[PDB]
Structure formats: structure tokens, C-alpha cells
Amino acid sequence: LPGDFGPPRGEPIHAVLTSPPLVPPPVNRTYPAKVIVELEVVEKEMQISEGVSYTFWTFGGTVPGSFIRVRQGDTVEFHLKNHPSSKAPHNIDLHGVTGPGGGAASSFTAPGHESQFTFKALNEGIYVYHCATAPVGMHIANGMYGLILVEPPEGLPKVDHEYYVMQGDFYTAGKYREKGLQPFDMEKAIDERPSYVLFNGAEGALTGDKALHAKVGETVRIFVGNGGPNLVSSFHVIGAIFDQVRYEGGTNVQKNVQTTLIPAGGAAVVKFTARVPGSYVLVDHSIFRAFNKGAMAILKIDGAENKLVYSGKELDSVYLGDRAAPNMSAVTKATQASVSGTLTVQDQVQAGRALFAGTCSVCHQGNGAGLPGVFPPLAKSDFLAADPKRAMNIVLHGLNGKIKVNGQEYDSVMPPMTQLNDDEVANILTYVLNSWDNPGGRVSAEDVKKVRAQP
Amino acid sequence: LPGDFGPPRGEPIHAVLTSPPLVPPPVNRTYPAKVIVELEVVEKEMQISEGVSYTFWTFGGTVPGSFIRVRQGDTVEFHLKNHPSSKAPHNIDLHGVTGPGGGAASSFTAPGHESQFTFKALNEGIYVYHCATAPVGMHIANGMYGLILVEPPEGLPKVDHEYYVMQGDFYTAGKYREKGLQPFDMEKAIDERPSYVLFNGAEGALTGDKALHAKVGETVRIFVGNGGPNLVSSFHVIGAIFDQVRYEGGTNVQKNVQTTLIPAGGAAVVKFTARVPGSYVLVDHSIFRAFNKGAMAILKIDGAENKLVYSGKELDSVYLGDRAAPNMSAVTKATQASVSGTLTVQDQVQAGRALFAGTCSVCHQGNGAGLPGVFPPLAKSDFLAADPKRAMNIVLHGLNGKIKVNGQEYDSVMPPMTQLNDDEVANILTYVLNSWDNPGGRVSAEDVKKVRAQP
Amino acid sequence: LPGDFGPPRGEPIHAVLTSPPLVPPPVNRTYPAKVIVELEVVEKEMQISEGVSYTFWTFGGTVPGSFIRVRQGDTVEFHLKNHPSSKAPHNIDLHGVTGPGGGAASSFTAPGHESQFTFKALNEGIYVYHCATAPVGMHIANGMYGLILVEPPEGLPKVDHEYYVMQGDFYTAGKYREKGLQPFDMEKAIDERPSYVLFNGAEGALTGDKALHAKVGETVRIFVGNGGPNLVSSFHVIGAIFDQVRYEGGTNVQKNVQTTLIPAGGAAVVKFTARVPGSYVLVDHSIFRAFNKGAMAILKIDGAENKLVYSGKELDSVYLGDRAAPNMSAVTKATQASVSGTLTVQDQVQAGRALFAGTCSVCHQGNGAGLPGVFPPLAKSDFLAADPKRAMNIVLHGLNGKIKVNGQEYDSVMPPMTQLNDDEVANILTYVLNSWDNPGGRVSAEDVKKVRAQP
Ligand code: HEC
Ligand code: HEC
Ligand code: HEC
Ligand SMILES: [Cu+2]
Ligand SMILES: [Cu+2]
Ligand SMILES: [Cu+2]
Ligand SMILES: [Cu+2]
């Protein structure tokens, strides 16, 4: 067989697993070992987006699950524990395992129980692992996937940084960014119509202050998984190129590409060399996923500009939208204040401030000034002040035709933004009303609900 | 040109075609020949799933159609007959043919007619063929696709087994597993929302007693097609790796991968070496296809276990669900008994028995015992017996909160299983009621229809 | 860095850009230059299909946008102008650019404004460029994408012809071929449910009299892009093979394949050698895209037939449907006559004539004769003449069972053709009624609207 390096030698190794986006250190070993892997399934509520909760099912408390790193030819003793708070039984199928179900039948584990099985890691490569319990798609859709790396015997080449990024598609009963605890939606899942498509389990998991980091001149290796359950990722780095892309344990290595297709259940190792400073965006280039469903992550590169290579400015909210900022924590706070019944005007203002970026500022500008004759001002806008309800209708339903704002005629078109949720429109408009010498007051989500029900 | 080996020599060969999942023998020939291929289109009703009929349109009576095997440089005289019972005209486009439409204009054949055309097989490779008659998508969706292999002049390397597997997506008016003769649904097809995604034309075509077979140490070559019409397959083998994957006649060969993307209309040759015994599952790893729409096939490997490579057990119904068993023939029989108006309790029981596997047994166990305090028993369940209608509501709509069953408190969550059809819920519950010292009686599909209409 | 060929030398070059499907000449240069690229965004209404208008947003007045061709190591000074008639601001992200956003932040351009930025072309390859303005998906869905080629320093190998083809998916409020100015539909876009999937911006952009051309024995290179926004293309040439397929600037080159997956936002260079005459169809082999949504383009090859390679006939309306003809201009004219209120019978007849090809002629024949006993005649049909309204119901809702037509019994099935729009059914039936000694008269779209509302 392949990976024929003999029986385990040395002492048993207890594998140290890491949480995304980090990776365990290189195994740095020239002999096969017995490696004991202990992974615990935990079901728990986490934020899939700001103010939006979801009951995740996780390997090790995170989505994706703990990263496992071993060497080709190791004997792996795999222990799966199912936390007693779990409602469902769980198990594991590891790609790269030689044997039926990738471990599935022997790792079946009821809540409060533990299972174990052993396998030899014959196949070098990066591999998805995932739950394999009926109904399988639900378990995977709830977050039960991660990566296992089986290193070549000599190790991978040294790089400056290694990161762990995994795409998944998620199916909520509610629409994108609709607040509250969102149940899983089987109808959307069967139809392959996800409400969110995400890197590492949440909107903004890898953006803003949670971005990945490197410096100019450094090499970055990223272990990229696609947990699915359903989507194939047109995986792409904005403004950069991959030096190498290698799928699973494949002999083929592609070089110098920017866009690469990762199958559902697939994994790849990609290598990047940072050449100029700024934010490089990892996306699924099925564009509505990246820009309307959350499928964007950032590798932020620090260092000296090189104007001979690129003269332009850093990425901003025109492209990245409301994820250009460090975080959108004001939205979480406003949502929690609504639930508690303590929503203040300032809670709404700060939430709207976060949501205004990109969404409105692309045309109206970050300072509300617009562009005279082309985009009308929201700053000190007589048209806004004159009719707040008309403003709600404008956001939801658009506006066109000749209007007069602060003494100037506009004759253009603002598209409808009907996908904004009632709280989002309310908070945005409350921000605008309380900025730029506008009259203050507030708009409530209930106000917006009524305007949505009858244009 | 390529395949420039001269005019046909020897005698004309009448091609012997094979039905899936078998393949004709290697051509074992060192000279170009004239090869006469005769293929007949037949439209006919077959079972797409147990108790579910569909009007297939087929090349040679099967889906996929008869496998055609020739040598690069052969001159192929292709005869297409359209059976007189056909309602539609038909034709053929063979990928790998050099010429407009891949044969489409010259192979147009009305019902009861025959056509013929000739082409030189210049391009070595594995290729999809399919109908090319307006409306093309309908013809393909109804099953009109297969594979043609054009061998390299020296032949392919010898292997122990060769098999023929083709994915297709199907569009029925009714939902998945809704019984009866199901018409084609154009609205679902245009939207690329299939009701079934299948290997070789039917649910379970390649599972259970219809599994593919090999022995430990043997090599298996599988000719894999994706007839579409629409889907791209994240093609994957559970618990194994492909030694090689080669697309069509491509010069590139990938090695040591487990997951590979096959385009709509694409074909690949994959090679597997059996290392340990058990069931290896071929899936489309867009998981809801494999586990909710039928996209799973089995290669069952016989031989001695190797505990140093894999210590675990064979695949079971936890992962494979109700396809772990040899067949689900009881469902076909119960469905036919309903149509005839002769449905007995025992017909329902045996049908429910088949459907209970995986679907319910993952939590409640194959013996109905559950797990005390975690999953409540269905065996001798006082809670079940106390209210049969409540049991129908539980399957359809779920259950949560504190309950008492056989003197023990449970405080967990059973998800809804709303996608089960009325007959499936009726048969499952009838099985349960007539097992494990439960009180007997029956539930009817009409009972379930009423509970579905008002929770 | 890569592309380290020194500072620009010689004189500044003003790039000459080309409109699809043409490509600028090879740069034919052995030194790095400064290349000044000037591109103007124009928003405008164009025909997405005959009688169907759409407001496209374009780079340079076309979809896809102007082709840009430079050499690896060039310094590119990129000027983006936004025409003053524009309603939206725009910018550009060029794949292959080294730097954040691929130019996005520095190329933000309000209506009536100009922006510029500079970059060094370090990466050789074919690359998509596209708008990068919030909401990004809308901008791209409206047509804002094209290709930039960065040649290797020695140039690409000489070929006889070079062409430029780009797929995109489009989202209209109305259904496929529903006439009028069609707004963009955000709901369909987010769900990845396009109404049209097109090469180069329109149905028939590259079919009939707008086909690409070459001669037997010549080599054709095609720069193929997938602008998306959302779909992955199972890109395929009917009846031919690609000698080479190279993605972006990748080191891997695949050879001798017919079907290849192009990611959303991906681009490839493919090479074809014409071997026999006829029409070769480029499609997205997700078949319902190619045959029901418009994703088909033609490379028409002139030259001597070779019966030893292919004995069959040229592609016709059986496969290609109504795109077999030179154009469908009669449909545009009938649609415009309806809007103006001047629709004549002959306008309808000529429009129906175009629409009858494939759609009806596959069974009923181009001369309406049918096939006695199998497909009934529309020529001098007593059954048609006897009840025009029944004919509308037949097209919309199908027909089966025993009928008598011109003294002969038929007992077959004509499927419903419910996806035909009211004007299409009206025009088809008006064509039939005014042909083949049928009684004349006309059917109106309003007639058909009433039959659709109640079968
Ligand atoms: C460009 C693509 C825009 C985006 C994004 C948003 N708005 Fe807009 N807005 C835009 C135009 C071209 C116009 C004038 C339309 C016309 O008929 O000429 C408007 C108008 C408004 C108004 C009314 C006018 C004013 O007071 O200046 C309001 C209150 C407004 N827009 C608000 C608004 C908000 C809150 C947005 C984000 C949610 C937003 N707009 C986005 C162009 C564009
Ligand atoms: C785990 C994922 C389950 C699957 C699959 C099925 N059931 Fe279940 N069931 C489950 C739990 C955790 C509970 C208790 C819920 C609570 O509120 O604590 C139940 C309960 C039932 C009952 C009622 C209790 C009893 O009699 O034991 C019935 C009748 C029942 N379940 C039936 C049932 C059937 C027929 C299933 C397959 C279709 C099935 N369940 C699946 C957990 C799970
Ligand atoms: C084959 C796939 C067909 C296509 C495409 C179209 N028609 Fe058809 N038609 C077909 C059959 C097999 C039948 C007879 C059905 C039966 O019950 O046996 C018909 C019938 C008609 C009729 C009525 C009979 C007649 O006058 O000949 C009409 C008026 C008719 N069909 C029209 C029609 C048109 C306009 C079509 C294109 C839009 C068309 N048919 C497509 C088979 C097929
Ligand atoms: Cu699980
Ligand atoms: Cu898997
Ligand atoms: Cu056919
Ligand atoms: Cu094809």
C-alpha cells in the first residue's frame, strides 16, 4: 500500500487541534506515530450575523471544526465525544480515510457517549471531514465539517503564515439578515437555495478586525475547504493571484491562477505571496454569494506601497460595503435592545451608521453631501425632512423622476432596496435623521413594516 | 488529422453494446475497422423509485443507454432506429464525433423509421452521447444519454473490472417519492430544480443487491458520465480515493483525488484499487442530491479485513439510510396493493419496515428501544399507544418539550419530517404499531393527509 | 517580482480596444511600454432578444465590454470615464491586477466624471474585468464585464483567427422572451435563477448571420469569459474538440477536450482546428441554458466536405431550433408594430414563420405535411380549420388521444408548450392559418391570453 512506512514508533502523540482560522504547527517528524485525536461535538446557538442567532452543530465548538494535522503513514486513534447537551446523535466521515463510510459506522455517538476507531493515514493531502448521520444534509448544513491535513513525509515547504478557511452554505427560515433565532429550513436546503453563504461560520468572521494578517513579501498558505452541503465555490482572491493551488492529495498542481472551482466536499491548499499592501478579499465569485449572502473574507497585508506596481488606494465601502469597517457591533447591540424593549434613539443611530456604509454611501457619500445635480444630499435635506414616510417608501420602493432637493433639480433613478429588513431601514433612516443638521426623531421597524405592506 | 491509421481493414465488425452497469470487452485490435453500431430508441414506463413510474425515453431500453466501444481511427457506421411505439422523433449527437451536430441532422428518425450516418473516430476518449431533438432538454431529461468509448490504439491498461455509471437529473411533477406515474415537469427543468438526481436511471439502481462488486486487491475502472441535463456533479467516493481521473480524451490525468467535478455533458474514466473490504459509496457530494434525491451508488468489496488500515465496521443505515438493505421491494408491493385496492396491514408493515431504516432508526434504534433518557422508545411505547393521531403529527411536525414515555422523562427535540409522503408516514407508523408488543391496527395515507392539512 | 522587465521604454502607447466578438491585434513588441487605456461606461437600452429591451450598463457600449490587450510587464495607465447620462457611479476591478480591489477604490467615477489609476501588468493570462460598485451583483448582471489579455513576452502562437466570447446570466422581471422593456429582477438574481443565459449580451448575438467564421484547416483561438454574475459554465463545442484549453494565466494546459468548466468570473483561451465544414455550436452544456435561455453561439466553417471523416449533413432547426435561420428580424418588426398599434396580418405571418422553425417543424415539418399516421399535418388541416380556439388550447396545453385529421387517425401525444408567450402562439398560429391553403384570418395575443386564463 501507499504510506507504507511501518508500524508506529516513538511515543503516542496527543494531537493538538486548532480552532479556525489557525492551524496546528507542522508535525516536524521523520517517523510514523500513533496519534490520538479527541474531538467533541457541541450543539449551540451562535451569531450567524449581527443580531441573528442560529443553532450550530459543531465539531469542537466552532464552524468549521477543529483542524487536525497528521503525517502520512500515521496510525490515528480517533475518539469522538458527543456532549450530553446534544439532542442528536453524531458521527464522522473523514475524507482520506481508507474504509467504508470514512469512519461513519464506528463513530456513531449518542448524546453523552464516546466512540473510537483507528485508521492508518495512507493518503497525503488536505481533506474535508463531516458528520455522516441521517439526515446527513441537515447535520452538515448546521455546521458539522472541518479539515484534516495529512502531511507528506518530508512536510510541506515552510511559509510565513498558515490559515484555515472553510466555505459553507446555510439555510434559515428567515431571509438574509432577518433578526432572531433562525431555524434550519429543510425546503430551502433541498432546493439548494441558501440564505447565507459564509466563510468560517458567520458573516464577518474574517473581515474587519477579524481579518487574516501578513506583511509584504511574506508567503501565506491557506487551507480552503468547502463543507457545502450543496454549493460549488468559484473560489477567488480579489487583487492577487495564487502561486499554487493543489486539490486534496492530487498529483496535479496548478500555478498562477486567481479563480478556482472547489467542489462540494472538496478542499485545496493555496499559496499566496504578498506583493503590495492592502486588503485582499477571498470570495465565492458567484457574485451574489459574496456580496449579498456573506461569502467574503479578508487577508490584510501591511507594508510599504509600491506605486510602480499599483498606484491606487486601499479597498473601501464602495466595493466591500458595510464590511469595510472594523465590525458592525452596533447592530448586535440595537437588536438586543429591541428584544429587551430598551431601544434608544442612539442605539438606532449607531446601528444605522454601520449599515449606511456602502448601502447608501456609494451614491449619497459617507457625509450625506451627494454630488450636486447627480446624487441628491441626505445632509440637511429639505426633501427628507418634509416627509419621513416618503423616505421609507423611497428606500423600500425606489424613486425616479424629477425632484427638487435643497434648491436643485435631480432627474435620476434610485433603485428599490426591498431586501433591507424593517429594522435595517428603520435604523438607517434614524441615523440619517440624527446626522448632518437633520431634524432628529426616529423611524421604527413597525413604521417600516406598515409602509412595506402597502406602497 | 489525428487518428490517421488508414482505411478500414479486416472484416466489418458489428458492435456489441452493453447495458449499464456493464461494459463491452476491450476491442483488442491492432488495425482500424469499420464498425457497425445499431441502436434503437424505445420510450417506456419504468420505475424511477419504488412505486413511482416515469416515462423514460431510452437508447436501447435503459438509462443510461447502451455503451458503445470502438477504437480510435475506426470508421463507424451508425444506425439509429426509432421504435414504432415512440410518440416523438429522435436523433443523436455523439461527443467525440468530428462534424456538425455530432451526427444530429443525419440521424433524425421518426417513429418506425431508421437513419444512418458514418463518421471516423478521430478522437480517443470517453464521451457522452445524447438526443439532439427539439426540445433538447426534455429529451435528455427523459433519459436519452449514454457513453461511447474511443480506445487508444494500444488499448487501455488491463484492470480486473470495468463498470458504467451515469448521473442524470430528473424533473417530476410530483415531489420526491410521491407515488404514481409522474409526468415530466418543464417548469422545474428550466429552473434546474430536479426532483431526483440518480445514477443509472433509478433510485437504488446500484445499491443493495444491485451493487457493483470487486475483491480486495483488485483494480476497478469506472466510466462515469454526467448526462445532466443541467447539474454539475461533485463526484466523490466515500471511504476511498481514485488512483486516476481522466476527463474525456484529455491529455491531463489527475491522480490520488477523492472528489472531482464532472460538467453537465461531461465524462471521465476513474480508477480505484480496493484496499479493504466494505461498501464504497459513489455520490454527488452536493449532499442533498446524494442523501435526499437518490444520488448514491455502491461498490461492494469482498475480502479480508485489515485492522491496521481500518478498524471500523461496514457501512450501515445510519449513513446510507434505507438503502443499506438489499432492496425496498416491500414499498413497490404496498404501492401496487393500494392502486388495486387490496392493501393489507401486512403489506403496510413490510413497507414501513423498509422505510424505518435510517429515517427513524438512527435515533429510535432498529429495535425501537431508543436510549433511556435521550431517545424515547417506540417499542411498547405507552405514549405512542395513547394517541395514534398525535404520532402522525409528531412525524409530520416534530415534537419538543418534556414528555413522559414508559415512566421516563425526555426533554429533547425531534425534528419535523414533513418531506415524508402520506403513504410513507402511514406505512412507517403501521410498522411501528405492529411491532414490539405495540397494539396493532393501522394508519392510512388518508389519515395522514388529514393531519397534514391541519396541524 | 514576476514580469520584471524594467521601466517602460519607447513611446506611450494608446491602447486600441475592440468590440466583441473581435480582438485587438497581437501587441508584437519586445519591450515593456506604458499603455494608456481609456474606457467609457455607457448605460443604455438594447435588445436582449427580439422585441425585448433591457437597460444594459456597459464598458464601451457593448456586452461584454471592450477587449483590452497588453503585454506582461507593461505599465498600464487606466482611465475610466462615466458618461454623463449614467444614473449610477461605476468603477472597475480587473483580475490580474496586483493590488487591493483590482483598481476598485481608485476608479470610482460618478456620472460625468473620469478617474485614473496605474498598475504594472505582472501576471500573464486572460482575465475578466468587471464593475465593483455596490450593489456589485446588479452592476455585473446589467452587463459590466469584459476581458483583458496580458500576453506573454514572446506573444501567443500565431493563429488564423481570434475571437472574443463571454457568457453572462441575466435576470429580467418578465419571463424568457416576454416582450417589452424588462427591468432587472433582484429576487431572481439572489436566487441564481436567470431568465436568460447569453453569449455576448443578446440572444442570437453569435448565431445565423452573426456567426463567427473560419475555413477548413484554419486555427481559431477564442478568448472565453464567464462574467456571471452567478453561473458556472459547462462550456462545450458541439461536434468538435478543443486542441487546448488554458485558464487565466495558469501553467496547466489541458488538451483534446470538448467540455470544460469555467468558473463565475473565470476566463480561458481555447484553440480549435477546423477539420470539416459546417456549424459548430458553443454552448453552456447545462442544457436548459443552451436550448431554453439562449446560451448558444456558432462558429461556421467553410470548405470541402470530407465523407471519410463525416458523412452527415449540416446543422438544422431540429437541433438549433429557430436559431438555424440567418436572423429572426420579423419578430422585432411584429413586436414594434404591436406597440405602435399597426400590427398587420403579414407582420404576424412573418414573425410566426421565424418562430415555427424547430418549435413546431420538428414534428409537423417545415412544410406542415407531418408524417402520415405519426404526426398530423398542419397543411390544409381540416382539424385546424374546424376550430382555431382549440388550436390555441393545443399549443398551450397539449393534446393526446385519438383524433382524425384529413381522413387519417392519429393516436399520439403533443406536449404542452406553455412557455410560449401569448404573442408567440398568436404569431405562430397566424403563420399556419395563412400558409398551405389554410383558411387565413389571424389569432391575436389577447385571444391567447384568454385561453391561457382558462383551459
Ligand atoms: C445610487 C445607486 C443610490 C443608492 C445606493 C441610494 N440612493 Fe438614495 N437616491 C439616489 C438618487 C439618484 C435619488 C434621486 C432620485 C430621482 O428621482 O432623481 C435618491 C434619492 C433619495 C432620497 C430622496 C432625496 C433626498 O432627500 O436627497 C432619499 C431620502 C434617499 N435617496 C435615501 C437613500 C438611502 C437611505 C439609501 C441607503 C439605504 C439610498 N438612498 C441609497 C441614489 C441612490
Ligand atoms: C432523532 C433525530 C430522531 C429521529 C430521526 C426520529 N425521532 Fe422520533 N423522537 C425523537 C426525540 C428526541 C423524541 C422526544 C422528543 C421530546 O419532546 O423530548 C421523539 C419522539 C417520538 C415519538 C413520541 C415518543 C415515543 O413514543 O417514544 C414518536 C411516536 C416518534 N418519535 C416516532 C418517530 C418516527 C416514526 C420516526 C421516523 C419517521 C422518528 N421518530 C424519527 C427523535 C427522533
Ligand atoms: C412533436 C413533439 C410535436 C411538436 C413539437 C408540436 N406538435 Fe403539434 N401535434 C403533435 C402530435 C403527435 C399531434 C396529434 C396528437 C394526438 O392526439 O394524436 C399534434 C397535433 C397538433 C394539432 C392538431 C392536429 C392537426 O391539425 O394536425 C395542431 C393544430 C398542432 N399540433 C399544432 C402545433 C404547433 C403550432 C406546434 C408548434 C408550436 C406544434 N404543434 C408542435 C406533435 C407535435
Ligand atoms: Cu451530526
Ligand atoms: Cu464527504
Ligand atoms: Cu429524443
Ligand atoms: Cu452534448
Ligand SMILES: [Cu+2]
Ligand atoms: Cu457599475
Ligand SMILES: [Cu+2]
Ligand atoms: Cu472579480
